[PDB]
Amino acid sequence: MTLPAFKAYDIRGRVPDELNEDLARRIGVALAAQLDQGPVVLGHDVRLASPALQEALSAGLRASGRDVIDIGLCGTEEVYFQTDYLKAAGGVMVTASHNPMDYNGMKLVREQARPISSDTGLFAIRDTVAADTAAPGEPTASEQSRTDKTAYLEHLLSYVDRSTLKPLKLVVNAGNGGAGLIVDLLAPHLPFEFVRVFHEPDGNFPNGIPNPLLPENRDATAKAVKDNGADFGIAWDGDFDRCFFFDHTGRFIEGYYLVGLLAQAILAKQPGGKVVHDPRLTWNTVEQVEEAGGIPVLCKSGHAFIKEKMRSENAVYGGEMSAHHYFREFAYADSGMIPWLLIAELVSQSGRSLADLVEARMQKFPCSGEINFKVADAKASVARVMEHYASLSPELDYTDGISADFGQWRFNLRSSNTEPLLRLNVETRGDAALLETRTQEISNLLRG
Ligand SMILES: O=P([O-])(O)O[C@H]1O[C@H](COP(=O)(O)O)[C@@H](O)[C@H](O)[C@H]1O
Ligand SMILES: [Mg+2]
């Protein structure tokens, strides 16, 4: 077979049987053979095994003559930012995202933090690692510790006019991941009053692995917002490249609506720009982008496709409904920090609550949320759906799975590239009844 830890977009597996120090060292050796000239940036998340996996990565890179820039405990976006900022050959973030306690992984990038994915070098690395029985060499290059975050923090702060900010009260919930360290470094430069929940980094995860989409974890942020009368709340996953928003009522805001809101925020600063969006949920983003004078650009979902499209279009901003937000000046990379700075600025400048900023949009384009189906035969299930609706003659688009536009409602139905699943998204033109009846109809067809 092949090493299971090598996935479409990154390396992910149980340690020590799918990922371990020896594999990590071999990955460093193989990565050195794939990169252009230059040093390699390494960072890690709060998981207990991450430092040792990073050290093994470093040992293999340095045995292959690569200088290593160790930026320490960080978020994924810091590896991206520093790789691009320092004009490094590439970078690796050691992180387990929201996988169980016995899991870890790696996200790899080359120059300008461009992704290394299964078809752009990651399976080449896998096959090299798989065949490598060579004795470990000794280091021929050095490691430098570079924990200074100044350039990163200045970059984050450059997205807002600090003189226009109001002293909003913000709940922040790191989930014992890494986000609190960055919040605390930003706080002396911001007027906000922070209510800190699950704030200290702790790889033992006493309050659960960080995942704000789980209702149990969601409610902890919601409760803190309501109990403290906060203006809004923000929660992150463990490597904080995903951010999640709660309005002043404690209501979690579906990530779809943040794409259009953040696009408007960015277009206010970079007028007329292009905005890249995914095909799962679309109508609200297209309308909000156009109303703000921007140009919406449809793109297949997944960070590699989004980033490539943004580069080829010089797009100012890209956003996915799955809580990933990409910014041109940020090495075209995703940040879990830039979005809440922009939203805080919007609330401060407009005098409108986060709830009011999105309320009418949610009524105008209600969506199902992403619903996942594990079925016996994905292809036959999709066919059952398309056969059922054929006589209505929807407009069909195959950018990413199947999108079907019926006029007052549409759906997208995809196979996941990270899991063996079918994913469904439905939205309507202001019609919650149609939304429910069509979602339930498709669900029944899929399960049949
Ligand atoms: O899950 P993450 O945070 O690593 O994110 C990854 O998977 C998500 C879901 O992909 P899919 O719907 O094909 O399963 C993508 O939207 C995202 O761009 C990608 O980087
Ligand atoms: Mg993440």
Coordinates of C-alpha atoms in Angstrom, one line a residue, residues 159-310:
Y159 CA -5.8 46.2 8.3
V160 CA -7.5 48.5 10.7
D161 CA -7.4 52.3 11.5
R162 CA -6.8 52.1 15.2
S163 CA -8.0 55.7 15.7
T164 CA -11.5 54.6 14.5
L165 CA -11.8 51.7 16.9
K166 CA -14.3 51.8 19.8
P167 CA -13.8 50.0 23.1
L168 CA -15.9 47.0 22.2
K169 CA -16.2 44.1 24.7
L170 CA -15.1 40.9 22.9
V171 CA -15.3 37.3 24.1
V172 CA -12.3 35.4 22.8
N173 CA -12.1 31.6 23.1
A174 CA -8.8 29.9 22.1
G175 CA -10.1 26.5 23.2
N176 CA -6.7 26.0 24.9
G177 CA -5.1 26.2 21.4
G178 CA -2.7 28.9 20.4
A179 CA -4.8 31.9 19.5
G180 CA -4.7 33.6 23.0
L181 CA -1.0 34.3 22.7
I182 CA -1.6 36.5 19.6
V183 CA -4.7 38.1 21.2
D184 CA -2.6 39.1 24.2
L185 CA 0.2 40.6 22.0
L186 CA -2.3 42.6 20.0
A187 CA -4.3 43.8 23.0
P188 CA -1.9 46.6 24.2
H189 CA -2.5 48.2 20.7
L190 CA -6.3 47.9 20.7
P191 CA -9.0 49.6 22.8
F192 CA -11.1 46.4 23.2
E193 CA -12.1 44.8 26.5
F194 CA -11.4 41.1 26.2
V195 CA -13.3 38.3 28.0
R196 CA -10.9 35.4 27.8
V197 CA -12.4 31.9 27.7
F198 CA -10.3 28.6 27.7
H199 CA -7.4 31.0 27.0
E200 CA -4.2 29.3 28.1
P201 CA -2.5 26.9 25.6
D202 CA -2.7 23.4 26.9
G203 CA -2.0 20.4 24.7
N204 CA -3.8 18.1 27.2
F205 CA -7.0 19.9 26.1
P206 CA -8.9 19.8 29.5
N207 CA -11.9 21.5 27.8
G208 CA -11.9 19.4 24.7
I209 CA -9.9 19.6 21.4
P210 CA -10.6 23.1 19.9
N211 CA -13.6 22.8 17.6
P212 CA -16.1 25.6 17.8
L213 CA -18.5 23.8 15.3
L214 CA -19.3 21.1 18.0
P215 CA -22.5 22.4 19.8
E216 CA -21.0 21.7 23.2
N217 CA -17.9 23.9 22.4
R218 CA -20.1 26.5 20.6
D219 CA -22.2 27.0 23.7
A220 CA -19.2 28.0 25.9
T221 CA -18.5 31.0 23.7
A222 CA -22.3 31.8 23.4
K223 CA -22.7 31.7 27.2
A224 CA -19.7 33.9 27.8
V225 CA -21.1 36.5 25.3
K226 CA -24.6 36.5 26.9
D227 CA -23.3 36.4 30.5
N228 CA -20.9 39.3 30.0
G229 CA -23.0 41.5 27.6
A230 CA -20.2 41.3 25.0
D231 CA -20.5 43.0 21.6
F232 CA -19.5 39.7 20.0
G233 CA -17.5 36.6 20.5
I234 CA -14.7 34.9 18.5
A235 CA -13.5 31.3 18.8
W236 CA -10.7 29.5 16.9
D237 CA -9.5 26.1 16.1
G238 CA -6.2 25.0 17.7
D239 CA -3.8 26.4 15.0
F240 CA -6.2 29.3 14.6
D241 CA -6.4 29.5 10.8
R242 CA -10.2 29.2 11.3
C243 CA -12.3 31.7 13.2
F244 CA -15.9 31.6 14.3
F245 CA -18.2 34.4 15.2
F246 CA -21.0 34.8 17.7
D247 CA -23.2 37.9 17.8
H248 CA -24.3 39.8 20.9
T249 CA -27.2 37.4 21.4
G250 CA -24.8 34.4 21.6
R251 CA -26.0 33.3 18.1
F252 CA -23.3 31.6 16.1
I253 CA -23.1 33.1 12.6
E254 CA -22.9 30.6 9.8
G255 CA -19.6 31.1 8.0
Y256 CA -21.3 31.6 4.6
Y257 CA -22.4 35.1 5.7
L258 CA -18.9 36.1 6.8
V259 CA -17.6 35.8 3.2
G260 CA -19.9 38.6 2.0
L261 CA -19.3 40.7 5.1
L262 CA -15.5 40.5 5.0
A263 CA -15.5 41.1 1.2
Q264 CA -17.4 44.4 1.8
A265 CA -14.9 45.3 4.5
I266 CA -11.9 44.7 2.2
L267 CA -13.5 46.4 -0.8
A268 CA -13.9 49.5 1.3
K269 CA -10.1 49.6 1.5
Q270 CA -9.3 48.2 -2.0
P271 CA -12.1 49.4 -4.3
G272 CA -13.0 47.5 -7.4
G273 CA -11.1 44.4 -6.4
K274 CA -11.8 40.8 -7.3
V275 CA -13.2 38.5 -4.6
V276 CA -12.8 34.7 -4.9
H277 CA -15.5 32.5 -3.5
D278 CA -16.4 28.8 -3.5
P279 CA -19.4 27.1 -5.2
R280 CA -21.2 25.6 -2.3
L281 CA -23.1 28.7 -1.3
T282 CA -22.9 31.7 -3.7
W283 CA -25.9 34.0 -4.1
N284 CA -25.3 36.2 -1.1
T285 CA -21.6 36.6 -1.8
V286 CA -22.1 37.5 -5.4
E287 CA -24.7 40.2 -4.5
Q288 CA -22.7 41.7 -1.6
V289 CA -19.5 41.8 -3.6
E290 CA -21.2 43.5 -6.6
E291 CA -23.0 46.0 -4.4
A292 CA -19.7 47.0 -2.9
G293 CA -18.2 47.5 -6.4
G294 CA -16.1 44.3 -6.4
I295 CA -16.0 41.5 -8.9
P296 CA -16.9 38.0 -7.7
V297 CA -14.9 35.1 -9.1
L298 CA -16.2 31.5 -8.7
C299 CA -13.6 28.9 -7.8
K300 CA -13.5 25.3 -6.8
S301 CA -13.4 24.9 -3.0
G302 CA -10.2 24.0 -1.2
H303 CA -7.3 26.3 -0.2
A304 CA -5.0 25.3 -3.1
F305 CA -7.7 26.2 -5.7
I306 CA -8.7 29.4 -3.9
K307 CA -5.1 30.6 -3.6
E308 CA -4.2 29.8 -7.2
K309 CA -7.3 31.6 -8.5
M310 CA -6.6 34.6 -6.2

